[PDB]
Design a protein around this ligand. Sequence first.
Ligand code: HEM
Ligand SMILES: O=C(Nc1cc(C(F)(F)F)cc(-c2cnco2)n1)C1CC1
Length: 435
Amino acid sequence: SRYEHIPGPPGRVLQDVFLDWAKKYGPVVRVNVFHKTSVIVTSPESVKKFLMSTKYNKDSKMYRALQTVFGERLFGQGLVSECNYERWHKQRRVIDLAFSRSSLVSLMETFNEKAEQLVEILEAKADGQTPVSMQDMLTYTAMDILAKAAFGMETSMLLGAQKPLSQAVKLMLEGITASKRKQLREVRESIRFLRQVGRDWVQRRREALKRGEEVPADILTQILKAEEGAQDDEGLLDNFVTFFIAGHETSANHLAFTVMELSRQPEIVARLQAEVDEVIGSKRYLDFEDLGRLQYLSQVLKESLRLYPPAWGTFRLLEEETLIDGVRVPGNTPLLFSTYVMGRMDTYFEDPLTFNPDRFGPGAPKPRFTYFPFSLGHRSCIGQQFAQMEVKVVMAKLLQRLEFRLVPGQRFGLQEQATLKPLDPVLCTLRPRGW
Ligand code: HEM
Ligand SMILES: O=C(Nc1cc(C(F)(F)F)cc(-c2cnco2)n1)C1CC1
């Protein structure tokens, strides 16, 4: 009853229902997400007010689904799901060190090596006939990159290793959205497995440090540092799992969506191929300076995130009753922000369903609080530049070497768990560039 005065209803996903309702009912709409009543706020004024202030914190009730699943601790109080400001701020500032300019520049070798491995595997299949799941291949690449970059481990998913691990991730993500008997069993065991991987890799790191082996400072270094005097390792494992999942899942989804969309954009692909040819030539390795020169690719990736944001948005807690765009919203209410919804509204983007990289051209007016694929403010993505770099490296190497055609019958639709991803496996046939 407390929300009844708020406007609202009396490969298609929940975000699409939200889009319809925002269009029908306006900038402040009452909805149902993760069992609770929330209010979807879609004016840029609101985006600015709530996301760009340390006064507004994440809503713990909406993050409970990440913290624990079916009685199994998952992301716990890790960096994504911690909703206490002071607790978040402590760990954020420590982990920030792993995402310094110099830290990320040093990762270029890892990005290049995994991208090169992917391309060599695809080249051998490029007979214009063999169907290849680009969703799968890009997920394996993203995982291999993350495991090495963040934790100094070799998952070798591109070599067909760690199949149970990939199964565990899938079942766990299904688990988040779920919240019969067999599904519960599978989800719980998957979560415990991932945390055990954490214990294993943490023990390996500690052993290396004791034996005085060389350990390059990485994300794991800072995750350990953040827990320097904790009672137990549960906080450490929270962050292990957080970074293990967040560090590859969205990157993989972003790559897959981009490949999927580009399969129906031959002119844009031709332009991208030309840009890569001109900037890097036949070089096997992209330098950091090369990344900045791939300006058209940067625009295409931005436009991909407008239409296909893997991370659709965020929640903040409204503590006190507040007027939001002429609507009285009661205190203690989750506000839902969605870059997916706003990206597809004609009031914010002309011809919203058209894929046009020119929206992000140098001279074009920049979206003002209508586009936030990495979120905004203090709780924005710590991994934003990491992700931007790795995806540019992967995409550039694909464009350098291969032509992709989507297998007829493959859909452009979405599926939604916690994050958005292609409904279909992005099955493509491949040919080497140059006939
Ligand atoms: C293209 C890929 C990516 C996208 C679109 C993306 C998007 C986002 C979004 C929307 C948030 C806000 C989440 C929320 O409010 O619940 C976020 C936060 C976060 N992301 Fe990412 N992300 C990406 C890649 C990465 C990578 C590569 C890492 C780690 C290596 C990462 C780690 C995180 C973490 C730890 C947070 C929580 C930050 C904080 O609250 O202090 N993400 N990301
Ligand atoms: O679910 C939410 N955030 C969320 C969830 C996930 C998950 F579950 F797929 F692991 C991953 C990321 C992420 C952020 N950066 C990279 O991955 N974010 C909030 C409540 C809406």
